[PDB]
Amino acid sequence: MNIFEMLRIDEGLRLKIYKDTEGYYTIGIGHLLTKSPSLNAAKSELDKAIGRNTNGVITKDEAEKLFNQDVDAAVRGILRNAKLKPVYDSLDAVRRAALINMVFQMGETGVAGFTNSLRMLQQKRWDEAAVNLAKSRWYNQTPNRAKRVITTFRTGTWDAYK
């Protein structure tokens, strides 16, 4: 298990434009295209992202290319953020993947707002952090996925993804 296999489980793989759990146009392995309700706007974002005039359909290789870029972008966002970087640096590689997962789903600014959970993670108060993380819109709207990520923070193992 690693961050790519983890997010592939959590996000799935779809080669045609679909709506994510929030209703937003998405493709591939959780590649958000736009929050606009216009399918045409989403297709324009897709064509720009891929470099060709699709029409809402991509290949598996193309989906994996976006995925690699999106995982990169999550890590780079963590490292450039003054709240997220110290927490990330303080973690083991398994829990680092859990934080990347959160940033992939919600964005750098969103995760950086979890001030109290971030402090508990920095303090390595794993059970307390897990309780605090679940007190969130995140957990309520995607509870099975959040439970997997929270278990990863709590245990530092991949048990929730086996």
The residues assigned a catalytic role are: 11, 20
Q: How far is the CB of 79 from Cl ion (least distance, A)?
A: 18
CB of 102 to Cl ion, least distance (A): 13
Q: With residue 42 as reference, give the H or E element that holds it.
A: helix 39-50
Q: Which stretch binds Cl ion (CB under 5 A): 22-30, 76-84, 87-95, 144-152?
A: 144-152
Considering only residues 83 to 142 of the shown chain, the ones binding Cl ion according to CB under 5 A are 142
With binding defined as CB under 5 A, does residue 26 bind Cl ion? no
Burial (CB count within 10 angstroms: exposed 0-12, middle 13-18, buried 19+), residue 92? exposed
d(CA 90, CA 124): 9
User: 116 or 141: whose CB is closer to Cl ion?
Assistant: 141
N-term to C-term CA, the chain: 8
CB closer to Cl ion, 66 vs 91: 66
Q: Which of 51, 53, 144, 162 binds Cl ion (CB under 5 A)?
A: 144
CB of 143 to Cl ion, least distance (A): 6
Nearer to Cl ion, 132 or 142 (CB): 142
* Shortest reach from residue 22's CB to Cl ion, in Å: 12
Lookup: tokens for 152: 């990863």
DSSP, collapsed to helix, strand or coil, labels residue 37 as coil
Contacts for 25 with CB less than 8 Å, ≥ 6 apart: 17, 18, 19, 32, 33, 34, 36, 39, 41, 42
Q: How many residues bind Cl ion (CB under 5 A)?
A: 3
95, 145, 148, 154: residue in contact with Cl ion (rule CB under 5 A): 145
Residues that bind Cl ion (CB under 5 A): 142, 144-145
